[PDB]
Write a protein that binds this ligand. Structure first.
Ligand SMILES: [Cl-]
Ligand SMILES: [Zn+2]
Ligand SMILES: [Zn+2]
Ligand SMILES: [Zn+2]
Length: 232
């Protein structure tokens, strides 16, 4: 009840929100490009362990995230997947690594993180090189839909809970602009969203990279906003 918003989270703190049985989002905030933004990740129960999707945008936040997970859930985080190479997704990987978490990303994400100067997940995910590729990874499916917010961006589906985590490829309804498009492929982004729509029509909950969860309408919303941005 009441998903937390940016005014409810001081930078440095992390909230968890149970989305469904064995699926939570984590929500943190950060100062960026002259504003304060919220950021979501995902936590998925993996037997008696946890699979983490994305850091909490930095070392300080990610430390808070690990503490909050122990406090509220009390199962160990054994694996983490970063869904693209920007700092809101890999920033805090070293904190995860030091805590004994195995960190993963596609080869493309690892390479781009290195070029950018960001933290580099240790493990490489295989089978996600080409638009339309999917692989099972523990209790989720990882899907590379094609370039969108970034050329490497992955989305994550939790089949047991019908939860689709879009990361920064999916915008919340409140957002009217396409966000930070410095590394985006605006031309491909609607096509990549269509691949997601066609693959996961059964999604009940859709979690954007930043802001409020909704339903599958978030996909249409994203292509609306992305097209409007492209057009000026
Ligand atoms: Cl490259
Ligand atoms: Zn990004
Ligand atoms: Zn983002
Ligand atoms: Zn809309």
């Amino acid at each position: 009840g009441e998903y937390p918003t940016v005014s409810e989270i001081p930078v440095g703190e992390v909230r968890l929100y149970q989305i469904a049985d064995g699926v939570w989002s984590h929500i943190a905030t950060q100062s960026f490009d002259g504003a304060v933004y919220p950021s979501n990740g995902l936590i998925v129960r993996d037997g008696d362990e946890l699979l983490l999707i994305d850091t909490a945008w930095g070392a300080k936040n990610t430390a808070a995230l690990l503490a909050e997970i122990e406090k509220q859930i009390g199962l160990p985080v054994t694996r983490a997947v970063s869904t693209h190479f920007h700092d809101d997704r890999v920033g805090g990987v070293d904190v995860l690594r030091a805590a004994g978490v195995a960190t993963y990303a596609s080869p493309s994400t690892r390479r781009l993180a290195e070029v950018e100067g960001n933290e580099i997940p240790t493990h490489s995910l295989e089978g996600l090189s080409s638009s339309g590729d999917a692989v099972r990874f523990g209790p989720v499916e990882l899907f590379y839909p094609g370039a969108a917010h970034s050329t490497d961006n992955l989305v994550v589906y939790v089949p047991s809970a019908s939860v689709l985590y879009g990361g920064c490829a999916i915008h919340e309804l409140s957002r009217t602009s396409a966000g930070n498009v410095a590394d985006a492929d605006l031309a491909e982004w609607p096509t990549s969203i269509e691949r997601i729509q066609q693959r996961y029509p059964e999604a009940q909950f859709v979690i954007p990279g930043h802001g409020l969860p909704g339903g599958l309408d978030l996909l249409k919303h994203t292509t609306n906003v992305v097209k409007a941005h492209t057009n000026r």
